[PDB]
Structure 1
Amino acid sequence: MNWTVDIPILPPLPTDLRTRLDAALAKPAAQQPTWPADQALAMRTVLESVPPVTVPSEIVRLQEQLAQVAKGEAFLLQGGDCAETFMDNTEPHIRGNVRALLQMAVVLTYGASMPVVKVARIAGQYAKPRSADIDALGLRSYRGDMINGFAPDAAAREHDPSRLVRAYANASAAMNLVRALTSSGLASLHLVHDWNREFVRTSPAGARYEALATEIDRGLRFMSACGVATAEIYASHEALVLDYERAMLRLSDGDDGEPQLFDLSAHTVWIGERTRQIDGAHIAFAQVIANPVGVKLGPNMTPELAVEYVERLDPHNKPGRLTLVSRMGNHKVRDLLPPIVEKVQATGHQVIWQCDPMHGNTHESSTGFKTRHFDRIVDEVQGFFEVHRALGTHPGGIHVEITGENVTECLGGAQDISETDLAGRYETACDPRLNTQQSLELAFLVAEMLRD
């Protein structure tokens, strides 16, 4: 049961982009998939002619909005599934993740009293890194459906290069739908916030959030009363699989009218903690592409390394071109983040300081499932805000993993999801996502932090 694509039988790069790109891919790359270099090459030839998932004008537009975030004048909300599955690439799932992001954005916008840039982990998040190459059941590790199968069989965990095309096909389908949803009635702010006032009515913790959901309702009605009457959701994934990102590269006149290389698998991509080798091919790939890029910074980050990233990835001091995504865990952020900020801020580069309160607070549960505690996530964002407020720098955004489904993958929250509940609805293919109820809860709380 399978379909079949023909292998073809694009214009040459200017010599410098040819060289820098070939130079960049020559360098070592962690966590890449093992599969025949000639099969991967067949895939990349398919992917080199397909209609792009994004287009350059949209990436330039995001670069401009992200510059406003960098400069303290807007706020970045990045969210979505931890790992996208070809299995769940369905309208109800996409719609509920779009809805979830749009809801959090209204709340965050009112809290920040400034615009929120919405970026979804969607339309390409089909690949993850693995600390160990053999998993709990002695099997080859699952690396995301761009690589192998979540199914726990020896045959499913084989790295299949055809999943490159299967990943693009799913990606541009989900993107088509995202485009359609965000230009439909789903985007209307008044519609989107009624979903939030529903949440307050039906939630156990409605009381904690009702005053604010009502303040927002009055802000929206205030708009209408003044004579006002859409949405932009950008695509992002971790750029982990260089074969994929290579194929999706397209050449176009850029911010300066000279030809640049845009990675059109998404609008923005981030290198993760296990792949940010400073002299590696990931970081060097990031130096050839025009896209906004981000870098995960965990607890072993030094102010001086952080600065080297800033000087390599933001060579031209383009505010908002580089995002630095902090994930230290709550007990470490207040101590570790300030020195990094002070030294980076001192260079004169305007980075976006994005908080990631998820990948620093995971812990195996007493049930066998890997989970995260709501109260620890809150604490790190809070701690992240405390540190930026102390320094006078901009808390530029968050980076959360969520679904529009009432899964039970994270503890606590309004539902006091306990360790014996994490088995009732553990849908995720990788890390524990906050269900929709905990998504909005956090958005409300982060909105409170944004206020004064």
Structure 2
Amino acid sequence: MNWTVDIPILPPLPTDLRTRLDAALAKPAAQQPTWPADQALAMRTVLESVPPVTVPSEIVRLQEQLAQVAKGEAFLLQGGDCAETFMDNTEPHIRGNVRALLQMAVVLTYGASMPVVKVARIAGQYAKPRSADIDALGLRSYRGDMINGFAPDAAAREHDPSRLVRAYANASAAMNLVRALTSSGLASLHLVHDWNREFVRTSPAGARYEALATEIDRGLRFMSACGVADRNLQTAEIYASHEALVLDYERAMLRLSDGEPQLFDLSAHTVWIGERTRQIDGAHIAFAQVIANPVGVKLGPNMTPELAVEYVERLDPHNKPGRLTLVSRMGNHKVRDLLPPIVEKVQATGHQVIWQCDPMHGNTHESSTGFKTRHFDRIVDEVQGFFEVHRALGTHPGGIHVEITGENVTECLGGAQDISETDLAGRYETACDPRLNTQQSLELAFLVAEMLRD
């Protein structure tokens, strides 16, 4: 029942990188798995010899496009599953999520009148933090498939270092498919947009989006009338991202680039540090300072303007637009009060970060029926508030970071489908937080396109 891998039995890092990497990893690290060190080492030794998920030239390219976002010349769409699972790492599922991002992106592009950088939560989003080590059933908490199992039994919840290699296998398989898919017919704007027009026809609030959908279609037809063939467009790039949480995994996937040599985390193109692991003197922030990838930090409602500035100065020490993304997650009822003084203070530093809205993690609650859930209207209202904040300051609302899937799940309440607490039981499939289903994700893109237009 096991495939078995041989433990390799080789370029030394430049002395300074070895020193800084060691210092970063010696700092305290929250939310790490508790598995034996000798077993972790063996797994990392396997991962240090595998082909990388991404390569440095792609990360450099992403950095260039994120700079444009930071400068107000592009918009960032980041999205995908809350938690990828080994079980659902399948072609239909992956294609569903790629398609939903593409569908959203064309609508946002038209509304923003500028390019949309597409970053999927995919090919590595297998680890999550927990506030409690014992869950509501008295079991050790599920921390994602890189760590332990979702099944509600003790043995499955044991931390298993073999999941580090299993997670890489799943991630590299998914990434291969994402690459194949973005240079397939799935890339074509016309294909992708006719999907949106089917969505408009079947949605209960379709008549509401019909005008913009038609306008987009006429735009695409105009492009074609002017002689623009699909043969000669910017062909689709979808980048890979996840939360950099398990440092055993991230450190094993570091590779030294071939103009000074730098350390790149090649488990992804970009990674972010979450609320529970962003300790300013912690290993995760220190790890982010050593790697060359673009990075994000999640900023919740206890964020101060002063700490935001300290993240900016530590994480973008050389003033490189787009290197750092600050991901606002303040709850729809607070975003308007809490965000402006953070934005003002950071902007005064002269650094150019991307300001990205995560309207999901600040707006979750537990339904009467037991399922943890989010209301579509709160998610939409946070994005609305985020846009108001930036428009008042004249700063750039740079992007959104959403949890979505191309499946017709029943996880977040509301939308045009008016998903109720009752409906939640029928198709609740997430291993963790509730995702916008394909219709809700589409509807949000339309709604956000209008915010971009106004």
Task: Write the distance in 2 (CA, Å) between the matches of 1:450 and 1:356.
Answer: 16
- 1:71-127 Cα shifts (integer Å, max 9, x gaps): 000000000000000000000000000000000000000000000000000000000
Superimposed CA distance per residue, residues 296-349 of structure 1 (whole angstroms, 9 cap, x where no aligned partner): 000000000000000000000000000000000010000000000000000000
Q: RMSD over aligned Cα, in angstroms?
A: 0.7
- Is 2-11 or 279-288 further displaced after alignment? 2-11
Deviations 1:40-95 (A, max 9, x none): 00000000010000000000000000000000000000000000000000000000
List per-residue Cα deviations over 1:413-444 (Å, max 9, x = no partner).
01100011110000000000000000000000
In the TM superposition, 1:335-346 aligns within 5 A as 335-346=337-348
The secondary structure found in structure 2 opposite 1:4 is strand
Residues 336-365 of structure 1, C-alpha deviations (whole Å, 9 max, x = no match):
000000000000000000000000000001
Secondary structure of 1:294's match? Answer: strand
Superposed displacement of residue 4, structure 1 = 1.1
Secondary structure class of the residue paired with 2:134:
coil
Q: What SS does the corresponding residue of 1:54 show, helix, strand or coil? A: coil
Q: Shift of the alpha carbon at 1:233? A: 0.2
- What's the secondary structure of 2:155's corresponding residue? coil
**Aligned equivalents of 1:10, 1:305: Cα separation in 2:** 39
Corresponding residue for 2:186? 186
Does structure 2 retain, via aligned residues, the 8 Å contact 1:10–1:48? Answer: no
Secondary structure at the aligned position of 2:217 is classed as: helix
The count of corresponding residues between Structure 1 and Structure 2 is: 449
Distance 1:218 1:312 in 2: 47
- Alpha-carbon contact 1:148-1:156 (below 8 Å) kept: yes
- Tell me how far apart the structure 2 counterparts of residues 189 and 10 of structure 1 sit (CA, whole Å): 44
SS in 2 for 1:274: coil
1: CA distance, partners of 2:10 / 2:442 = 44
How far apart are the structure 2 equivalents of 1:58 and 1:434? Answer: 29
CA distance in 1 between partners of 2:262 and 2:208 (Å): 49
5+ residue gaps, structure 1, are none
Structure 1 residue 10, shift from structure 2 partner: 2.6
Q: Which residue of 1 aligns with 2:413?
A: 411
Give TM-score scaled by structure 1 length: 0.99
Identity across the alignment (%): 100
1:239 aligns with 2:241: no
Alignment of 1:3-402 (within 5 A): 3-229=3-229, 230-252=235-257, 257-402=259-404
TM-score calculated relative to the size of structure 2: 0.98
Deviation sequence 1:194-221 (CA, Å, 0-9, x none): 1100100111110111100110001111
* CA distance in structure 2 between the partners assigned to 1:361 and 1:294 by the alignment: 20
2 CA distance for matches of 1:274 and 1:222? 48
Instruction: Tell me, in whole angstroms, the C-alpha distance in 2 between the residues paired with 1:240 and 1:221.
Output: 45
SS in structure 1 of the partner of residue 46 of structure 2: helix
Q: 1:198 aligns to what SS in structure 2?
A: helix
Could you report, residue by residue, the CA deviation over 1:247-303 in whole angstroms, capped at 9, with x for unpaired residues?
Answer: 000001xxx900000000000000000000000000000000000000000000000
Q: What's the offset of the Cα at 1:2?
A: 2.1
| SS of residue paired to 1:388 | helix
Q: Is the 8 A contact 1:40 1:243 kept in 2?
A: yes
Q: Is the Cα contact below 8 Å between 1:120 and 1:234 reproduced in 2?
A: yes
